[PDB]
């Protein structure tokens, strides 16, 4: 049931909610204005016509103009500190926007961690995001800082904001493992 994906305010990318199912994707993608459908190691035709041991759909809100940072191989701020795609299994990254006939909750704006590093007397260690995990700055995002203490020092989180459009633009990272249609 993909109702929580379509019902409720979409979270920010750093606070993405993962929905694991252990289906009719034609209907699910019919009511989103799919702008980009980048499928890795799997055809865009076979994702809805194959049985899977386990299916995961990570969904979060992220602007379309900033989607170049979530592309594979991107590095630096906003590219490795919010979410990292897991390429161990075949993936399908979908950048879409819900259609007008469907109602979606609209958050205040788009928020993401531009850079979550650990500064101190011995330097700044970047706390990059592991594939499928969070940024360690999730609870202090987008902008904040705490005192870990010791060699690490201060956990500094630097965020960014963007004025969101008339409708939310949401990213879906679909991952399957080797759930029948």
């Amino acid at each position: 049931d993909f109702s929580p994906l379509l019902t409720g305010t979409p979270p920010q990318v750093y606070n993405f909610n993962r929905l694991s199912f252990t289906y009719n994707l034609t209907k699910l993608l019919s009511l989103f204005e799919v702008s980009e459908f980048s499928c890795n190691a799997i055809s865009p035709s076979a994702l809805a016509s194959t049985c899977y041991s386990s299916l995961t759909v990570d969904y979060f809100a992220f602007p379309l103009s900033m989607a170049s940072y979530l592309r594979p191989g991107s590095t630096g701020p906003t590219a490795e500190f919010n979410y990292r795609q897991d390429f161990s299994n075949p993936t399908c990254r979908v950048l879409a926007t819900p259609s007008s006939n469907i109602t979606i909750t609209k958050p205040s704006n788009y928020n993401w961690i531009r850079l979550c590093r650990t500064t101190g007397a011995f330097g700044n260690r970047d706390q990059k995001v592991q594939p499928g995990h969070y940024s360690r700055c999730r609870y202090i995002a987008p902008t904040g800082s705490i005192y870990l203490g010791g060699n690490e020092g201060y956990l500094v989180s630097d965020g960014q904001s963007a004025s969101m459009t008339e409708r939310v633009q949401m990213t879906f990272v679909i991952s399957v493992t080797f759930v029948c249609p």
Binding site: T119, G120, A121, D158
Partner: peptide, 17 residues
């Protein structure tokens, strides 16, 4: 000195940026 430099680096990365 170590904690003073911790505070200085915490407050200097933001201001320099």
């Amino acid at each position: 000195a170590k904690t003073f430099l911790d505070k200085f680096n915490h407050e200097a990365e933001d201001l320099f940026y």
